[PDB]
Amino acid sequence: GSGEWEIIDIGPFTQNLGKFAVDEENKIGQYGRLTFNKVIRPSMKKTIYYANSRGMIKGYEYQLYVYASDKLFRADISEDYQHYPHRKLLRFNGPVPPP
Amino acid sequence: GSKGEELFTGVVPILVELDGDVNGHKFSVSGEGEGDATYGKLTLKFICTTGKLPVPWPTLVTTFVQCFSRYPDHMKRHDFFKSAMPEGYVQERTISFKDDGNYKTRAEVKFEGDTLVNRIELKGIDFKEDGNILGHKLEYNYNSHNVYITADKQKNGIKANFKIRHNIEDGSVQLADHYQQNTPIGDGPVLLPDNHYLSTQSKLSKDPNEKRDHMVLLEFVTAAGITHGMDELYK
């Protein structure tokens, strides 16, 4: 299962998660070619656990608001330590209204 | 007590090199870090240099330097590993995964300059295509184990037996039975130990900045199983 969502800051590492999302979305092509602008607040994170009685940490999930090509998107990213490559884009859509 | 023991009184740089072949799947790994046997402490980072590792990282932890074990003062006469340095020792294992395939490893552990180097060849066979190992069904974590050691006077070295417990994603546990033989490379005298064991704790982690398939290891190893001060009871 998973833990609870909590706010995180939007430093360079979080910006890089946004760049990852836009790179991944560009491979899929639904929105044409997008140019990363910025990740804005709020950014959210939760812990992912193995689905068994030990409940150890398996990875993390992120929810971001990302500007690309001056339009606002919502991107969800998972980090899963069991399987390489560890980051996967789960969701990328919009444009959405500002938070 | 050995001459080789003086080589581990401070922090020692470590290099690890592995070439593997599991069910035909060839791969290579490089690792680097340091060890501080005063505290039984190892810090290492491994990178697969051939792309994606075809087996789970946890399966290779025991293969990737027991000379960094902390031996208590009253047990220093039983530290074979340091006594073999700097010429070093050969470490051979068979690792049998219960209801699956097996690894066979031969490694040389020795100083090259100031660096302690572990160079490994590994061959795995008889693995199931969607078993826990080729199927990548192991949790990315590690348990604490004891390594049980006895002298092997015949070969002027030691042998060890232990069973690794690998957490499986479905909640089960995969056993990996380890049989190990170590023998010195040189022909200086070595220390042949009484029965004892190494108590080992390991933490696995990831480098958030690393794009390669990789493993970060923090380990603590402490020798145990021989009582302290027995003599004084009879005085």
Curated annotation (Swiss-Prot), chain B:
Effect of S30R: In mut1.28; shifts fluorescence lifetime from 3.03 to 2.76 ns. In mut2.2; shifts fluorescence lifetime from 3.03 to 1.94 ns. In mut3.3; shifts fluorescence lifetime from 3.03 to 1.88 ns
Effect of H145D: In Cerulean; leads to improved quantum yield, a higher extinction coefficient and is 2.5-fold brighter than ECFP
Family indicated by similarity: Belongs to the GFP family.
Impact noted for substituting N195I: In mut2.1; shifts fluorescence lifetime from 3.03 to 2.50 ns
Effect after changing Y39N: In EBFP1.2; shifts the excitation and emission spectra to shorter wavelengths and increases quantum yields compared to BFP
PTM description: Contains a chromophore consisting of modified amino acid residues. Maturation of the chromophore requires nothing other than molecular oxygen.
Function: Energy-transfer acceptor. Its role is to transduce the blue chemiluminescence of the protein aequorin into green fluorescent light by energy transfer. Fluoresces in vivo upon receiving energy from the Ca(2+)-activated photoprotein aequorin.
Protein name: Green fluorescent protein
